Amino acid sequence: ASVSEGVLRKKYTKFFQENIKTHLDLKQALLKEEKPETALLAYSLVSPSGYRGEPLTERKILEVVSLLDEVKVDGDTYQQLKNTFDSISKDPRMQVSLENQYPGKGVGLLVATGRELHKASVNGDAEAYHHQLEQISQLPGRDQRLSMPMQQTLAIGHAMLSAEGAVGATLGMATGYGLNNEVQDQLKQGPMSGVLPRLEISNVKGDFTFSMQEPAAVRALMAYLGPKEDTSMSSPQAPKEAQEMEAARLTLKQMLGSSPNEHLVPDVDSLLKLSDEDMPSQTESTANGAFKKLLSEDWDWLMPAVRAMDKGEAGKINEKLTYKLPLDAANGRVYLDKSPNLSDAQLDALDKLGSPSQLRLMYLAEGWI
């Protein structure tokens, strides 16, 4: 109802037939019709980074992200995303989020193997947490333009880190490469992520440009959309520079599904505790322990529990998820059942959350709650 991609490289193959290797003199070749003002909008994805600081300026995936930037039918939803990005790119608060995920821009064989079997299992769980999360935003009431490609990027990024865990554990066990490029070529097959705008950054440290199909720029965008608004920056008492970067911030936080009351501060650190005043308020702390129970009892229980909660029917969770599996016993097949044993205390806490925001479920899939 909100997203429909394709993989037809033969419908518009004239843009990829000749050896076009120049960012300049490509807008005339990208017109190709009697439409001019809307063919420039698909060129706006690569145009601020089309000259400054890049190698060879036309990599073979930079055209398919510009060809399949389908603005031909609809020119409203992508323009709203383009009016919001580069309006979000003004405060240092987005920029300090784009510096935490980055740098500056014998018995010892049993230990080093276990450090990389832990890496292959954490990233194998967290990849599966985004596959059952791209079918929660398939349910009615959600949206798919911002929710789908944001978490399709992360599921590719966890599939590569999980592959590097046990390829490294194999080459260390069989000793005490070309396999990482074979799996990198494999995960680009099949579908591909929807096009989001470019998120250029210009400041006193230079003029930077990130990609938003990188798993580290996605991971810093959702950390920006976390915290609630304050008493400042949205009142008309301060018309200075705030209302064009705060209403652009809240129109993405609502676009996931998070109301401006919802706080959602991250957790990962090297410290013991986080703080005192930004703590979850024991109604969602009881509820976050219920969602973690649904992630780690079954591979298929998070989607029909959010579906049962959008209808306001979050008290029938113990009965709508029960199913029976067989069991060979000493008396025959018995057909016992598996139910999520949600207690009444955390079944009540799922009621006071009206619907889980998509931003809350994506912090949960990254281990930030």
Partner 1 sequence: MTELCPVYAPFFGAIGCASAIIFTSLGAAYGTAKSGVGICATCVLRPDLLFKNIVPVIMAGIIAIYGLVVSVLVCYSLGQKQALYTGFIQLGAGLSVGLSGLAAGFAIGIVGDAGVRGSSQQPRLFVGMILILIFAEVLGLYGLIVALLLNSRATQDVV
Structure tokens at 323: 């199913």
> In Å, how far are 15, 26, 252 from 80, measured between CA atoms?
26, 25, 10
Size of site (CB under 8 A) for partner 1: 41
Cβ-defined contacts of 93-97 (< 8 Å, 24+)? 93/224, 94/201, 94/224, 95/201, 95/203, 97/220, 97/221, 97/223, 97/224
The alpha carbons of the chain give a radius of gyration, in whole angstroms, of: 24
Pick between residue 40 and residue 173 the one whose CB is nearest to partner 1: 173
Span 98-117, contacts to partner 1 by CB under 8 A: 113, 117
Length in residues, the chain: 369
Q: Which of 288, 285, 287, 269 has its CA nearest to residue 350?
A: 287
Q: Is 33 in the site for partner 1 (CB under 8 A)?
A: no
Span 145-184, contacts to partner 1 by CB under 8 A: 158-159, 162-163, 165-167, 169-170, 173-174, 179, 182-183
For the CB of residue 64, give the shortest distance to partner 1 in the complex, in Å: 20
Q: Is 235 in the site for partner 1 (CB under 8 A)?
A: no
From candidates 214, 296, 316, 345, binder to partner 1 by CB under 8 A: 296
* Binding track over 183-212 against partner 1, x by CB under 8 A: x--xx-x-----------------------
Structure tokens at 22: 């120049």
Q: What is the number of alpha carbons within 13 Å of residue 287 lying toward its C-beta?
A: 22
Return d(Cα 182, Cα 174) in angstroms, integer. Answer: 20
* Binding track over 65-104 against partner 1, x by CB under 8 A: ----------------------------------------
Return d(Cα 124, Cα 121) in angstroms, integer. Answer: 5
Q: Is 294 in the site for partner 1 (CB under 8 A)?
A: no
Q: Which spans of this chain sit near partner 1 (rule: CB under 8 A)? A: 113, 117, 120-121, 124-125, 127-128, 131, 158-159, 162-163, 165-167, 169-170, 173-174, 179, 182-183, 186-187, 189, 296-299, 325, 327-331, 334, 336-338, 341
